[PDB]
Amino acid sequence: CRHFSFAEIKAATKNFDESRVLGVGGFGKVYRGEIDGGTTKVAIRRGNPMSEQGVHEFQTEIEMLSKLRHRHLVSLIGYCEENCEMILVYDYMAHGTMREHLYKTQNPSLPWKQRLEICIGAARGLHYLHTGAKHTIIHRDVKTTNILLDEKWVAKVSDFGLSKTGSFGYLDPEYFRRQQLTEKSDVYSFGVVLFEALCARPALNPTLAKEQVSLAEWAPYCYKKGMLDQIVDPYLKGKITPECFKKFAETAMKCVLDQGIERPSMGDVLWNLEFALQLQE
Template structure:
């Protein structure tokens, strides 16, 4: 579909509430195109009073990240539950980043991408209102206390959904969208365990060329420790293959149930052993003897390729999705026997 972007801050209401100097050379954030009716149709602007009402004055906190605090709220006549993210004023998160996320979420639509309900910009408050995903994030289900471990087939299905969502970001619109912060905290789960990618705060929009070469952009180093692509950290050049690397870390985290910091210290920092050897030694004890051998071989192979040192050698997310589907087929066939 088309990817019209609005100009300036026309979607953000009264000019007295706007940032006074929104100019930037970063094409991710600013466009000279006229305002799009899609924005006003799909992106509701809440007043701060409305936000305070739907959250009962920010009564119920669902969690906190480095950028903001998420509150539970209810909107509309049906009292639809929503997640209201109130950005911290001291987080280093600015208006242009906020605008970037609103624009992207307003115009990107995919079953494996979080849906935007609306936003609020008022009295120095920056607030996003998203659909509420009842099962929380994948990180909690891998590392939380007093939870039932996810079965292997479900973990595979979640990974396939995330791969599908990333493939859409990279190829499904007029521009390549590089997420830049793929991690299990940003993978949310609905009632049916369908994953939805969130956290597009740091995402970059890159022109989609007709050639199959990598989409490159110079970028400040952003992302989360343990998930960041070392090639991106070393060169400052961001490509969609940086997301592929981060997803490879997610795959290792899913199969081991180890936090990414541990994975980085034990394996990724110096890679002094094969990935297959590391994965076999560190597979989640709940999964031992439950993974079909051919499924395991495919999973380990695609994970290893995602984590290759050179981005150009890594697979694209479409290939990753296909390989994970193949792995799932082997597992399902074995489970039927």
């Protein structure tokens, strides 16, 4: 994990030109830049060291990502702590977040097979977090804005600021009851991602009728009542084979079960998604 001088960062971002702002968030602004004389494009996050959670989140991200390597996780190339600043350098995910290709966007809708391959990629990333590091890593912030897409549409899990080792629509309701957090909490949030990919609507819409506010409650309700097909993304209607639809929906339903101990592991989710992709052929 390489250290960047603050002069290298500023050359990469052309002194943090708002020309290069890809997006802004709680941690800070993210800039599009290039390093190694322009051969490598990078995303550069500038935090504010006066925030302790900004600093905590910065430190968590470096201790986690410096030890992980996986095709479906955003790679941390390095950081810059000079001037006691907080700069993180990742490779650039050219197509942004999964959310911005699902709804409230004017990007075109994603074909069904591409949505499934994105979910499969994210599942492999989470599977690696749960089974491939020294100890289980609970991401704690799986959501459609923390799955990024590179220029060949490969899905990568990102934003490791809240993860631990050793967002409203997505929180495991068992955590406000059992007060213990498990990798099954990632499985719950991922089940919500799956329904978001199918339904192309936010996980939490506070303006709706009481039954529909929470996708994690609404979509299973609709399935049991035999009407999940009516709330699917209009672009996807008619495009999902019946056997793929049943397998995808049943997998998603199992993920958002009430008790974590009844939920499948990510390995089981991943295999069932790959099986759903085979049934779509």
